[PDB]
Design an enzyme around this catalytic site. Structure first.
Site, PDB file in Angstrom:
ATOM      1  N   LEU A  22       0.849  -1.190   0.000  1.00  0.00           N
ATOM      2  CA  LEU A  22       0.000   0.000   0.000  1.00  0.00           C
ATOM      3  C   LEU A  22       0.889   1.247   0.000  1.00  0.00           C
ATOM      4  CD1 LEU A  22      -2.634  -1.052   2.627  1.00  0.00           C
ATOM      5  CD2 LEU A  22      -2.773  -1.231   0.112  1.00  0.00           C
ATOM      6  N   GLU A  30      -9.121   0.662   9.030  1.00  0.00           N
ATOM      7  CA  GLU A  30      -9.456   0.560   7.622  1.00  0.00           C
ATOM      8  C   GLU A  30      -9.300  -0.902   7.169  1.00  0.00           C
ATOM      9  OE1 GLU A  30     -10.500   0.980   3.818  1.00  0.00           O
ATOM     10  OE2 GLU A  30      -8.436   0.305   4.126  1.00  0.00           O
TER      11      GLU A  30
END
Ligand SMILES: NC(=O)C1=CN([C@@H]2O[C@H](COP(=O)(O)OP(=O)(O)OC[C@H]3O[C@@H](n4cnc5c(N)ncnc54)[C@H](OP(=O)(O)O)[C@@H]3O)[C@@H](O)[C@H]2O)C=CC1
Ligand SMILES: CCc1nc(N)nc(N)c1C#C[C@@H](C)c1cc(OC)cc(-c2cccc3cnccc23)c1
Length: 186
Positions: A22, A30
């Site tokens: 990411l 999240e």
């Protein structure tokens, strides 16, 4: 399968990946939202199916593959069998969905979740019929090498609120984000 779901987290500059991971630091809640949405089946005795591209599969830390509590399907044209630990392999999204109807999976799958990456999202978002897109808007730019296709508002509507999804801006580790839900019916 009468409905498909996509789920993605995306930076202000449309980024979803950088160097096989990411673009932003890990956001615990999240991630838990991703886990909750993809794992929760509404039918006891069935599991949800997660569909992902090959690089997304290898971006999952090995110790967490396959994603627990979900049937894991990998898309690849080059692979001849599923990667070690993955449950299924298909050459296309269409082939993956048809598989859900064959005897192995017939009454085993509840919801189908597309979990990336870019080309898998692009195709899924163009698939006919009802589709929901769960898009986490990370409200900062982050350096990225993998991106999310722009959502076509001719097709998709941003839903103002949505049951089971928080509406207010969230913040973790100083990073603000918000959960959005988009839908098309046809
Ligand atoms: N922020 C987020 O929500 C998410 C972020 N990511 C990040 O994105 C990056 C990985 O995604 P990306 O680089 O786009 O790669 P993908 O996960 O999409 O993997 C690409 C490969 O998957 C196969 N493939 C992809 N799409 C299809 C398709 N539609 N039909 C058949 N096969 C397909 C092909 O394999 P082959 O070459 O074998 O034919 C292709 O080379 C990583 O950095 C990851 O961390 C990924 C998912 C979500
Ligand atoms: C950014 C996390 C995320 N958020 C949303 N809203 N949608 C998504 N598709 C994703 C994602 C993602 C993929 C690329 C991904 C990356 C990743 O890097 C570590 C981990 C997972 C993942 C998913 C589910 C369970 C997991 C358990 N252990 C490790 C990883 C797990 C899933």
């Amino acid at each position: 399968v009468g409905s498909l779901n996509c789920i993605v987290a995306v930076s202000q500059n449309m980024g979803i990946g950088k160097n096989g991971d990411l673009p932003w630091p890990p956001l615990r809640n999240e991630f838990r939202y991703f886990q909750r949405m993809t794992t929760t089946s509404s039918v006891e005795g069935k599991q949800n199916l997660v569909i992902m591209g090959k690089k997304t599969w290898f971006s999952i830390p090995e110790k967490n593959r396959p994603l627990k509590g979900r049937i894991n399907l990998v898309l690849s044209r080059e692979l001849k069998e599923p990667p070690q630990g993955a449950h299924f392999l298909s050459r296309s999204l269409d082939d993956a969905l048809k598989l859900t109807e064959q005897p192995e999976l017939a009454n085993k799958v509840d919801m189908v979740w597309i979990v990336g990456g870019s080309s898998v999202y692009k195709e899924a978002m163009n698939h006919p019929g009802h589709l929901k897109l769960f898009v986490t808007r990370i409200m900062q730019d982050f350096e990225s090498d993998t991106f999310f296709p722009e959502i076509d508002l001719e097709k998709y509507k941003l839903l103002p609120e949505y049951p089971g999804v928080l509406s207010d801006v969230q913040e973790e580790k100083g990073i603000k984000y918000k959960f959005e839900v988009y839908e098309k019916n046809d």
